[PDB]
Amino acid sequence: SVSIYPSSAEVLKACRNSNSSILLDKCPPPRPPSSPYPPLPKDKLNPPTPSIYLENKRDAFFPPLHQFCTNPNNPVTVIRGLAGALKLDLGLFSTKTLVEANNEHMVEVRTQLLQPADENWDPTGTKKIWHCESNRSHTTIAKYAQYQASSFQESLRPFKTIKFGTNIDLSDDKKWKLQLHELTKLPAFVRVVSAGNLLSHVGHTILGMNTVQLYMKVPGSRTPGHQENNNFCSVNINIGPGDCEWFVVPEGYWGVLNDFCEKNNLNFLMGSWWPNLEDLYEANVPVYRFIQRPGDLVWINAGTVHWVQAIGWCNNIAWNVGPLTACQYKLAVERYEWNKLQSVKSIVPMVHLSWNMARNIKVSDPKLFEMIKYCLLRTLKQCQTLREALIAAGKEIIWHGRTKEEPAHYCSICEVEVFDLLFVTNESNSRKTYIVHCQDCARKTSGNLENFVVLEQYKMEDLMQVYDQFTLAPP
């Protein structure tokens, strides 16, 4: 076993400084990948869905299940019969039970057009378009449940308008104690919290990622195309009683879809679009398409592009997990860097997270370990390079510290993550609102930060110690 990274002292010494370099500061910039090679012929563009057929509770705790779902060659896995094999009480998530539990709870309503089959037409039924319009409003569980039940009775006897109940927050364990406890029966690799889940080492709540979200659906309710925040895997269980239809594109094709968006004058990361399948076929993009029944679990693998529509009436619950794998960490870092270049907020603060991983996790896989320690090295050097430059300009550094569960801070202007050294205007320091800016956004306002002090959250000696103690663990 060979260490390939310099000591924190060595990194420190090189920041104090025509010497030799320790590493190449210039990193190649992120960019969308080209269409995958080798290309796929027309006859391979509708592949079948990787499927797991559970019968016994023992079946669900079979270790090879974990490796099958995280395998990069499987963009999505449907786990059939999951709820029945664990004897999960999905009734705890039925609309009737939810109304009884918290009838005032908020629901974010998306009002959409009911579209036909797998297509997306402009409002006049004239042409098939990618942009799928929606309006955001808000209501209560009781009011949305009314509409959902009403809508089913209307069904029992040129586009109609439907309402999708989205982003229902199930994080509060004192409002949802029985619901959340039921999900502790799941095997570790799909649980909301676990030691092998990267999002469980964030140290604070990431709403909808390390907490459960619920969706309430009528037929036609659509989830537009997207990748997960920072390419984290997603877990989704259909409560029933109706089915959902899923559309999945492998991660490696996200650059192709990015280009379709640009050309269609749509934003890939932030827009709402429903892909035209004839467009994807034309470009030799394979599309996985399947039905998720009540009690089926859907595993969206890292970076997989997906979209969904309800076929019947149903609720879904969903959250993220981050497998402790090189593939997962690598894709989360790449999207983190791409988000910076696009001025898109990273919902997962990958720098904060990586340092927490280095504190908590004994990593035995060499490839994953090397990626993490490399991230520590670059950020440790970036911090000390800024710290030195501050001293060199005589601008002092207020010890601000932080609490154990204090979230990561983002820049008020550009929304990049700000680690260790925060820039706050004096009128924001004085009123202790501590409006955080990144270094760049502050200077665009004060050449030498006239209106700015800088707070320090970590002791450099603490960072240097975590870096030095992060070593490759034995198998």
Ligand X SMILES: O=C(O)CCNc1cc(N2CCc3ccccc3CC2)nc(-c2ccccn2)n1
Under the binding rule (CB under 6 A), the answer on residue 333 touching ligand X is: no
Residue nearest to ligand X (CB): 223
Given the structure tokens 């990787």, which residue do they identify? 50
The residue type of 73 is: N
Kindly state the helix (H) or strand (E) to which residue 110 belongs, with its residue range: strand 106-113
Question: Token digits for 246?
Answer: 């899923």
**CA angle (437 as vertex; 433, 442 as ends), nearest 5:** 120
Is 306 annotated among the ligand-binding residues? yes
* Rounded alpha-carbon distances, angstroms, from residue 418 to 127, 148, 209, 415, 434: 45, 43, 20, 9, 13
Under the binding rule (CB under 5 A), the answer on residue 413 touching Zn ion is: yes
Of 59, 321, 61, nearest to 187 (Cα)? 61
Under the binding rule (CB under 5 A), the answer on residue 414 touching Zn ion is: yes
Question: Exposed/middle/buried for 69, CB within 10 Å: 0-12, 13-18, 19+?
Answer: buried
Q: Using the rule CB under 5 A, which residue among 51, 134, 146, 194 binds Cl ion?
A: 194
Q: How far is the CB of 291 from Zn ion (least distance, A)?
A: 44
Under the binding rule (CB under 6 A), the answer on residue 215 touching ligand X is: yes
Under the binding rule (CB under 5 A), the answer on residue 424 touching Zn ion is: no
- Please identify, using beta-carbon distances, which residue of 296 and 456 lies nearer to ligand X: 296
Under the binding rule (CB under 5 A), the answer on residue 382 touching Cl ion is: no
Per-position x/- string for 429-448, each x denoting binding to Zn ion as judged by CB under 5 A, each - no binding: ---------x--x-------
Size of the site for Cl ion (CB under 5 A): 2
Which of Zn ion, ligand X, Cl ion, none does residue 438 bind to, with CB < 5 to 8 Å depending on kind?
A: Zn ion
Under the binding rule (CB under 6 A), the answer on residue 236 touching ligand X is: yes
Using CA atoms, how far apart are residues 87 and 8, in angstroms rounded to an integer? Answer: 51
- Please identify, using beta-carbon distances, which residue of 78 and 383 lies nearer to Zn ion: 383
- Please identify, using beta-carbon distances, which residue of 221 and 428 lies nearer to ligand X: 221
Is 131 annotated among the ligand-binding residues? no
- Please identify, using beta-carbon distances, which residue of 141 and 438 lies nearer to Zn ion: 438
Q: Are 202 and 332 in contact (CB under 8 A)?
A: no
Q: Using the rule CB under 6 A, which residue among 77, 166, 276, 425 binds ligand X?
A: 166
Q: How far is the CB of 357 from ligand X (least distance, A)?
A: 22
Is 105 annotated among the ligand-binding residues? no
Under the binding rule (CB under 6 A), the answer on residue 301 touching ligand X is: no
Which of Cl ion, ligand X, Zn ion, none does residue 148 bind to, with CB < 5 to 8 Å depending on kind?
A: none
Under the binding rule (CB under 6 A), the answer on residue 229 touching ligand X is: yes
The residue type of 121 is: W
The number of C-alpha atoms within 13 Å of 261 and in the hemisphere containing its C-beta is 20
Under the binding rule (CB under 5 A), the answer on residue 195 touching Cl ion is: yes
Of 151, 177, 155, nearest to 165 (Cα)? 151
- Please identify, using beta-carbon distances, which residue of 317 and 438 lies nearer to Zn ion: 438
Using CA atoms, how far apart are residues 358 and 420, in angstroms rounded to an integer? Answer: 16
Under the binding rule (CB under 5 A), the answer on residue 129 touching Zn ion is: no
Q: How far is the CB of 108 from ligand X (least distance, A)?
A: 8
Q: How far is the CB of 297 from ligand X (least distance, A)?
A: 12
Of 92, 314, 143, nearest to 215 (Cα)? 314
Is 411 annotated among the ligand-binding residues? yes
Is 414 annotated among the ligand-binding residues? yes
Using CA atoms, how far apart are residues 36 and 319, in angstroms rounded to an integer? Answer: 29
Using CA atoms, how far apart are residues 231 and 320, in angstroms rounded to an integer? Answer: 10
Using CA atoms, how far apart are residues 401 and 87, in angstroms rounded to an integer? Answer: 47
Which of Zn ion, ligand X, Cl ion, none does residue 348 bind to, with CB < 5 to 8 Å depending on kind?
A: none
Q: What is the DSSP string of 418-472?
A: E-SEEEEEHHHHHTT---EE-HHHHHTT-TT-TTEEEEE-S-HHHHHHHHHH--P
Q: Using the rule CB under 6 A, which residue among 11, 81, 130, 228 binds ligand X?
A: 228
Which of ligand X, Cl ion, Zn ion, none does residue 295 bind to, with CB < 5 to 8 Å depending on kind?
A: none
Is 438 annotated among the ligand-binding residues? yes
Question: Token digits for 413?
Answer: 């202007």
- Please identify, using beta-carbon distances, which residue of 319 and 423 lies nearer to Cl ion: 319
Residues contacting 374, CB < 8 A, separation 6+:
5
Which of Zn ion, Cl ion, ligand X, none does residue 414 bind to, with CB < 5 to 8 Å depending on kind?
A: Zn ion
- Whether the bond between 39 and the residue before it is cis, its omega within 30 degrees of 0, is no
- Please identify, using beta-carbon distances, which residue of 171 and 451 lies nearer to ligand X: 171
- Binding region for Cl ion (CB under 5 A): 194-195
- Binding region for ligand X (CB under 6 A): 110, 134, 164, 166-167, 215, 223-224, 226, 228-229, 236, 272, 308, 316, 318
- Binding region for Zn ion (CB under 5 A): 411, 413-414, 438, 441
Q: Which residues are annotated as a binding site for Zn(2+)?
A: 411, 414, 438, 441
